[PDB]
Symmetry: C2
Subunit: 153 residues, 2 copies
């Protein structure tokens, strides 16, 4: 696959659409779109392991972490594959997302297709928060919206 | 992987959960679960090509058809890889889904992870109807509910 897409929804007002593009096998992945209904500020943004929304976003499990690393930010060597950092909303509640990432993929063992993208209640501290949870979740709190990442046209 | 899941959502509520299991990559896929909120009778049931719900189930495109075949039933050689036939709802509006299929897969070129499962308004005629559409869509009509197929734990 070269293109993927995710519709983010949850139980509250947070909703969005996120697109992915990967031009080349083993090249970087462009990630772009918009999320609305958010509180102003940073909100953690990750790919979680399972594309399972059976009981809502909780069913998606932990961060996608095929290489058994600690949590980090997207520009860290020490990160989960799924660690895409934060999106940032304005007072208007909108986060415009524009990310390139070279660790996620749309094929192979780092593939994110069929997994869940999640936007969080709180900021992700990118593993620099100095408690144990920082190293696992980034202290980003509950899951406000999510969706399964699908193959796109 | 060897398990996948799909949450179907549409107006009614037409709602359902479908589980997938494939014991080995060269093996059949067990498909099972429940869909509620349906009218009594047969409803077409297929994997569509794109895991895109941007604008609702319409965004998923046509039946998943990597081999460029005509529409058929699941037992037919001439079928789309996505052709899973019909589910049947009782007077209570529930369809008990219990399928094994050897053409879909959870890995490889026929993988359905990241694609959309759809349940339709009307019966699928399994390509045996009296017109040209039968060999494309089975005449199953609109899309009552769908979801993106994700990797499960
Ligand atoms: Cu997350
Ligand atoms: Cu269909
Ligand atoms: Zn992480
Ligand atoms: Zn078909």
């Amino acid at each position: 696959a070269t293109k993927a897409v995710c519709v983010l929804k949850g139980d509250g007002p947070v909703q969005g659409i996120i697109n992915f593009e990967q031009k080349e096998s083993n090249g970087p992945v462009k990630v772009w779109g918009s999320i609305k209904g958010l509180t102003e500020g940073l909100h953690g943004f990750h790919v979680h392991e399972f594309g399972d929304n059976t009981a809502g976003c909780t069913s998606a499990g932990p961060h996608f972490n095929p290489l058994s690393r600690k949590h980090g930010g997207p520009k860290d060597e020490e990160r989960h594959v799924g660690d895409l950092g934060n999106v940032t909303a304005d007072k208007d509640g909108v986060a415009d997302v524009s990310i390139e990432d070279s660790v996620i993929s749309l094929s192979g063992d780092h593939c994110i297709i069929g997994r869940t993208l999640v936007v969080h209640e709180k900021a992700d501290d990118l593993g620099k928060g100095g408690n144990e949870e920082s190293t696992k979740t980034g202290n980003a709190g509950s899951r406000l919206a999510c969706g399964v990442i699908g193959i796109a046209q």
